[PDB]
């Protein structure tokens, strides 16, 4: 787990999020710890805000803006990402 601050730029945050549309699901082991399903970063725009902040493709999103998103729907995670006008704090598992 690492915490990253991303500042929205003229290309947005510059990443794509991908994952389940439903809520809940089975536990999975990631790095020896158990988590319910996580959305993940499916693309990172080169030179965009997420890239500059150190976000990488494949990162699993554990928290958005301090809110745990295990088992969250895609919509819940997108809405949390969009909660701030400019600042985004992600906790990711690489």
């Amino acid at each position: 787990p690492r915490v990253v601050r991303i500042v929205k730029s003229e290309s947005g945050y510059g990443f794509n999020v991908r994952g389940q549309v439903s809520e809940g699901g089975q536990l999975r082991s990631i790095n020896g710890e158990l988590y319910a399903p996580l959305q993940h970063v499916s693309a990172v725009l080169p030179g965009g805000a997420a890239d500059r902040a150190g976000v990488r493709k494949g990162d699993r999103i554990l928290e958005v803006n301090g809110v745990n998103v295990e088992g969250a729907t895609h919509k819940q995670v997108v809405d949390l990402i969009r909660a701030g006008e400019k600042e985004l704090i992600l906790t990711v598992l690489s």
Partner: peptide
């Protein structure tokens, strides 16, 4: 059933 969104 997954979805992908650019942000």
């Amino acid at each position: 059933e997954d979805q992908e969104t650019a942000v």
